[PDB]
């Protein structure tokens, strides 16, 4: 669920994590349109394409199973649909950490009026 | 500034405050249009009309002065324009706490395609 994705972002990125990633560029948030702005916005484009392959369960409200091992997050459980949602969430938090050196404040709370070009294929 | 409105919401409502209130209904977010959905969404409509009466400084990017006394938020400083922006943010925080009994998960991360009716005037 989105409550679990928020707890995962603060463990990997620090105390101000959720406020820094809730709205950035043309793709960071639920849904999106147009073309990506930089490397950080591209991590969120891949996350939307991953949620689109899920059939039978809901990514906003359904709960999955996970554990923490000395800094490393690992997915578990026995339902195939719920485990698929946990893997989409784990891969995006590692992409945010690898690209921290190019994050730019001119793109935080950007707007939809600047995302009006022909949309990029998955 | 918008960074200050987020930190004030986490002090009054608790740890999961920013994830619950910065994306909800037709007006809690950037670029509002249409008709308010419920009581919590109407607290955000009144806050948008309050910002429109400020004529010599910018609500999105300019920083103000504030502190705490007996558990309540208090606004300060030596510039009248900046103090007016602080007062709009404090009143909205009290409206969220007074209406908590009626919050609904159906309106959390609501899509923009559901808000295309004519807009209610201030
Ligand atoms: C899918 C994605 O990138 C994303 C980013 C932030 C939040 Br909150 C929800 C989803
Ligand atoms: C004025 C108001 O309620 C509001 C809420 C969210 C965001 Br982002 C901006 C403004």
3-state secondary structure of B73: strand
Best to test chain A binding among B13, B22, B60 (most A CBs inside 10 Å):
B22
Containing H/E element for A91?
A: helix A80-98
Chain breaks in chain A (C to N over 2.5 A) after: none
Closest residue on chain B to A15 (Cα):
B15
CA of A43 to the centre of ligand 1 (A): 10
Angle at B34 between CA B32 and CA B38, to 5 degrees: 90
Closest CB from B2, B105, B112 relative to A109: B2
Please, are residues A93 and A66 in contact by the beta-carbon 8 Å criterion? no
The CATH fold assigned to A1-122 is Phospholipase A2 (1.20.90)
3-state secondary structure of B67: strand
State how far residue B18 is from chain A, nearest Cα, in angstroms.
7
Cβ under 8 Å to B: A residues 8-37: 18-19, 22-23, 29-31
Question: Which member of B41, B89, B101, B104 is catalytic?
Answer: B89
Q: Can you give the residue ranges of every domain in chain B?
A: 1-122
* Token digits of residue B67: 């502190």
B80-98 vs B39-51: helix axis angle to the nearest 10?
Answer: 170
B117 phi, psi to nearest 5 deg: -80, 165
Q: How far is CA B80 from CA B85, B87, B117, in A?
A: 9, 11, 37
3-state secondary structure of A122: coil
Q: Is B28 in the pocket of ligand 2 (CB under 6 A)?
A: yes
Q: Where are the beta strands (DSSP E) in B1-122?
A: 66-69, 72-75
* Token digits of residue B88: 């709009």
Residues from chain A that touch B105, judged by Cβ atoms under 8 A, are: 61
3-state secondary structure of B103: coil
Radius of gyration of chain B (CA): 15
How far apart (Å, rounded) are the C-alpha atoms in residues B30 and B26?
A: 10
Please, are residues B105 and B40 in contact by the beta-carbon 8 Å criterion? no
What does the DSSP 8-state code read for residue A118?
A: P
Please, are residues B26 and B34 in contact by the beta-carbon 8 Å criterion? yes
Active site residue B89: yes
Closest residue on chain B to A109 (Cα):
B30
Q: Which method was it determined by?
A: X-ray
How far apart (Å, rounded) are the C-alpha atoms in residues B27 and B36?
A: 7
What is the DSSP track for B19-46?
A: HHHSSBTTTBSSS--S---SHHHHHHHH
Please, are residues B81 and B54 in contact by the beta-carbon 8 Å criterion? yes
Bridge partners (DSSP) of residue B71 are none
Residues 6+ apart with CB under 8 A from B117: B34, B35
**Structural resolution in Å:** 1.9
B74 phi, psi to nearest 5 deg: -130, 135
């Amino acid at each position: 669920s989105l409550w679990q994705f928020g707890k995962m972002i603060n463990y990997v990125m620090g105390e101000s994590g959720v406020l820094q990633y809730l709205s950035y560029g043309c793709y960071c948030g639920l849904g999106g349109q147009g073309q990506p702005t930089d490397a950080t916005d591209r991590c969120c484009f891949v996350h939307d394409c991953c949620y689109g392959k899920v059939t039978g369960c809901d990514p906003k409200i359904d709960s999955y199973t996970y554990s923490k091992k000395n800094g490393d997050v690992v997915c578990g459980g026995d339902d195939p649909c719920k485990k698929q949602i946990c893997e989409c969430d784990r891969v995006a938090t590692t992409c945010f950490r690898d690209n921290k050196d190019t994050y730019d404040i001119k793109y935080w709370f950007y707007g939809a009026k600047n995302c009006q070009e022909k949309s990029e294929p998955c």
